[PDB]
Design a protein around this motif. Structure first.
Motif, PDB file in Angstrom:
ATOM      1  N   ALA A   4       0.844  -1.189   0.000  1.00 49.45           N
ATOM      2  CA  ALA A   4       0.000   0.000   0.000  1.00 49.45           C
ATOM      3  C   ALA A   4       0.881   1.241   0.000  1.00 49.45           C
ATOM      4  CB  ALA A   4      -0.939  -0.003   1.202  1.00 49.45           C
ATOM      5  N   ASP A   5       0.823   2.001  -1.089  1.00 47.10           N
ATOM      6  CA  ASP A   5       1.531   3.272  -1.196  1.00 47.10           C
ATOM      7  C   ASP A   5       0.521   4.392  -0.981  1.00 47.10           C
ATOM      8  OD1 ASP A   5       3.500   1.517  -1.853  1.00 47.10           O
ATOM      9  OD2 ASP A   5       3.733   2.181  -3.931  1.00 47.10           O
ATOM     10  N   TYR A   6       0.546   5.004   0.202  1.00 45.82           N
ATOM     11  CA  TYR A   6      -0.410   6.047   0.540  1.00 45.82           C
ATOM     12  C   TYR A   6       0.081   7.435   0.163  1.00 45.82           C
ATOM     13  CZ  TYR A   6      -2.578   2.315   3.222  1.00 45.82           C
ATOM     14  OH  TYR A   6      -3.152   1.125   3.604  1.00 45.82           O
ATOM     15  N   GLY A  22      -7.536   8.325  14.333  1.00 49.04           N
ATOM     16  CA  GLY A  22      -6.726   7.311  14.969  1.00 49.04           C
ATOM     17  C   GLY A  22      -5.372   7.094  14.335  1.00 49.04           C
ATOM     18  N   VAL A  23      -5.137   7.643  13.142  1.00 47.13           N
ATOM     19  CA  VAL A  23      -3.862   7.503  12.450  1.00 47.13           C
ATOM     20  C   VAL A  23      -3.547   8.830  11.780  1.00 47.13           C
ATOM     21  CG1 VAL A  23      -2.593   6.280  10.653  1.00 47.13           C
ATOM     22  CG2 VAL A  23      -4.176   5.010  12.094  1.00 47.13           C
ATOM     23  N   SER A  24      -2.284   9.240  11.854  1.00 44.15           N
ATOM     24  CA  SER A  24      -1.906  10.417  11.080  1.00 44.15           C
ATOM     25  C   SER A  24      -1.745  10.041   9.609  1.00 44.15           C
ATOM     26  CB  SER A  24      -0.604  11.013  11.603  1.00 44.15           C
ATOM     27  OG  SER A  24       0.473  10.113  11.421  1.00 44.15           O
ATOM     28  N   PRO A  25      -2.105  10.924   8.675  1.00 45.22           N
ATOM     29  CA  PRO A  25      -2.041  10.542   7.257  1.00 45.22           C
ATOM     30  C   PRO A  25      -0.630  10.456   6.703  1.00 45.22           C
ATOM     31  CG  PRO A  25      -2.987  12.774   7.582  1.00 45.22           C
ATOM     32  CD  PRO A  25      -2.240  12.380   8.824  1.00 45.22           C
ATOM     33  N   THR A  26       0.359  11.047   7.369  1.00 45.49           N
ATOM     34  CA  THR A  26       1.738  10.997   6.905  1.00 45.49           C
ATOM     35  C   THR A  26       2.481   9.757   7.382  1.00 45.49           C
ATOM     36  OG1 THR A  26       3.902  12.058   7.158  1.00 45.49           O
ATOM     37  CG2 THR A  26       2.232  12.527   8.830  1.00 45.49           C
ATOM     38  N   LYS A  27       1.895   8.984   8.295  1.00 47.43           N
ATOM     39  CA  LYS A  27       2.508   7.764   8.800  1.00 47.43           C
ATOM     40  C   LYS A  27       1.822   6.510   8.280  1.00 47.43           C
ATOM     41  CE  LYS A  27       4.163   9.904  13.078  1.00 47.43           C
ATOM     42  NZ  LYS A  27       4.013   9.950  14.559  1.00 47.43           N
ATOM     43  N   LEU A  28       0.877   6.650   7.346  1.00 49.13           N
ATOM     44  CA  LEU A  28       0.228   5.479   6.766  1.00 49.13           C
ATOM     45  C   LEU A  28       1.229   4.579   6.055  1.00 49.13           C
ATOM     46  CD1 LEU A  28      -3.097   6.975   5.352  1.00 49.13           C
ATOM     47  CD2 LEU A  28      -2.879   5.225   7.124  1.00 49.13           C
ATOM     48  N   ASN A  29       2.271   5.164   5.459  1.00 49.57           N
ATOM     49  CA  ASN A  29       3.304   4.370   4.808  1.00 49.57           C
ATOM     50  C   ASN A  29       4.163   3.616   5.809  1.00 49.57           C
ATOM     51  OD1 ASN A  29       2.525   5.063   2.232  1.00 49.57           O
ATOM     52  ND2 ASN A  29       3.921   6.815   2.099  1.00 49.57           N
ATOM     53  N   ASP A  30       4.167   4.047   7.071  1.00 52.33           N
ATOM     54  CA  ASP A  30       5.054   3.408   8.085  1.00 52.33           C
ATOM     55  C   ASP A  30       4.383   2.209   8.764  1.00 52.33           C
ATOM     56  OD1 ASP A  30       7.712   4.432   8.232  1.00 52.33           O
ATOM     57  OD2 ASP A  30       6.850   6.368   8.826  1.00 52.33           O
ATOM     58  N   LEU A  31       3.103   2.282   9.118  1.00 51.33           N
ATOM     59  CA  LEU A  31       2.477   1.134   9.832  1.00 51.33           C
ATOM     60  C   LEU A  31       2.091  -0.014   8.884  1.00 51.33           C
ATOM     61  CD1 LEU A  31      -0.105   3.717  11.123  1.00 51.33           C
ATOM     62  CD2 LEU A  31       2.243   3.512  11.944  1.00 51.33           C
ATOM     63  N   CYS A  32       2.193  -1.265   9.364  1.00 47.33           N
ATOM     64  CA  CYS A  32       1.746  -2.492   8.640  1.00 47.33           C
ATOM     65  C   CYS A  32       0.378  -2.842   9.232  1.00 47.33           C
ATOM     66  CB  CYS A  32       2.594  -3.712   8.990  1.00 47.33           C
ATOM     67  SG  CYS A  32       3.982  -4.096   7.888  1.00 47.33           S
ATOM     68  N   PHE A  33      -0.578  -3.316   8.429  1.00 47.06           N
ATOM     69  CA  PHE A  33      -1.904  -3.666   9.004  1.00 47.06           C
ATOM     70  C   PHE A  33      -2.316  -5.068   8.556  1.00 47.06           C
ATOM     71  CE2 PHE A  33      -2.244   1.023   8.954  1.00 47.06           C
ATOM     72  CZ  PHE A  33      -1.581   1.302   7.782  1.00 47.06           C
TER      73      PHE A  33
ATOM     74  N   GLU B   9      -7.397  -2.202   9.782  1.00 48.20           N
ATOM     75  CA  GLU B   9      -7.555  -3.073  10.936  1.00 48.20           C
ATOM     76  C   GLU B   9      -6.195  -3.307  11.587  1.00 48.20           C
ATOM     77  OE1 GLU B   9      -9.511  -6.758  10.157  1.00 48.20           O
ATOM     78  OE2 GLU B   9     -10.667  -6.689  12.024  1.00 48.20           O
ATOM     79  N   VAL B  17      -1.141  -6.065   4.301  1.00 46.98           N
ATOM     80  CA  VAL B  17      -0.782  -4.780   3.631  1.00 46.98           C
ATOM     81  C   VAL B  17       0.275  -4.070   4.479  1.00 46.98           C
ATOM     82  CG1 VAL B  17      -1.851  -2.916   2.288  1.00 46.98           C
ATOM     83  CG2 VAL B  17      -3.296  -4.692   3.300  1.00 46.98           C
ATOM     84  N   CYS B  18       1.335  -3.554   3.847  1.00 50.00           N
ATOM     85  CA  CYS B  18       2.421  -2.850   4.584  1.00 50.00           C
ATOM     86  C   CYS B  18       2.945  -1.679   3.745  1.00 50.00           C
ATOM     87  CB  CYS B  18       3.559  -3.806   4.913  1.00 50.00           C
ATOM     88  SG  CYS B  18       3.149  -4.952   6.255  1.00 50.00           S
ATOM     89  N   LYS B  21       8.913   0.068   2.605  1.00 53.25           N
ATOM     90  CA  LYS B  21      10.016   0.210   3.592  1.00 53.25           C
ATOM     91  C   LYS B  21      11.098  -0.828   3.280  1.00 53.25           C
ATOM     92  CE  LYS B  21       9.704   2.758   7.753  1.00 53.25           C
ATOM     93  NZ  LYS B  21       8.769   3.189   8.818  1.00 53.25           N
TER      94      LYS B  21
ATOM     95  N   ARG C  32       1.777   6.074  15.521  1.00 61.13           N
ATOM     96  CA  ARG C  32       0.559   6.262  14.740  1.00 61.13           C
ATOM     97  C   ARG C  32       0.157   7.718  14.561  1.00 61.13           C
ATOM     98  NH1 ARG C  32      -4.024   2.215  17.091  1.00 61.13           N
ATOM     99  NH2 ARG C  32      -5.224   3.912  16.131  1.00 61.13           N
ATOM    100  N   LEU C  33       0.363   8.564  15.567  1.00 63.75           N
ATOM    101  CA  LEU C  33      -0.167   9.920  15.567  1.00 63.75           C
ATOM    102  C   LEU C  33       0.956  10.948  15.575  1.00 63.75           C
ATOM    103  CD1 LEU C  33      -3.043   9.506  18.192  1.00 63.75           C
ATOM    104  CD2 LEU C  33      -3.223   9.436  15.706  1.00 63.75           C
TER     105      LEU C  33
END
Lengths: 49, 49, 50
Positions: A4-6, A22-33, B9, B17-18, B21, C32-33
């Motif tokens: 996922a490339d946000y 609940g999530v910052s939009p600039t860190k979407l590329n950093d978290l895995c879900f 989620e 999805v990640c 990185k 996250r934030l």
């Protein structure tokens, strides 16, 4: 099960509304879900709020 | 106005999805900032039985 | 011995409480934030933990 490339969305400058909760939009590329079951529709502008 | 909602989620399970990185080398028995499968922290790692 | 162990066991378990925050894990909030929003969650953890 895909990458996922946000930045493509966030930095496109076409989307009038970017609201992340609940999530910052600039860190979407950093978290895995586990999953991001996305949704799609067409609404009026005044109801976008 | 075209609308997509992306619900992410974040649960205690393997991620599909990640964000883009680069995975690096693994260092053992030394104090390291670590990120395993999205789990971030700081500590030293030891081989476990 | 039992009362002292219970006091510390209770103190340990309070770390898993949210106290109104989105997550009880401090590292999960920071990852996250952004600081303008990550802080608001942190004072909720600080108030509960203090």
């Amino acid at each position: 099960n895909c990458v996922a490339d946000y930045s493509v969305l966030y930095n496109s400058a076409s989307f009038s509304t970017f609201k992340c909760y609940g999530v910052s939009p600039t860190k979407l590329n950093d978290l895995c879900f586990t999953n991001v079951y996305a949704d799609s529709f067409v609404i009026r502008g005044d109801e976008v709020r | 106005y075209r609308v997509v909602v992306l619900s992410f989620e974040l649960l205690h399970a393997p991620a599909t999805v990640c964000g883009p990185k680069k995975s690096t080398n693994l260092v053992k028995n030394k104090c390291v900032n670590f990120n395993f499968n999205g789990l971030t922290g700081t500590g030293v790692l030891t081989e476990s039985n | 011995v039992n009362q002292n162990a219970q006091a510390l066991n209770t103190l340990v378990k309070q770390l898993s409480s949210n106290f109104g925050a989105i997550s009880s894990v401090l590292n999960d909030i920071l990852s996250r934030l952004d600081p303008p929003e990550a802080e608001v969650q942190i004072d909720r953890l600080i108030t509960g933990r203090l």
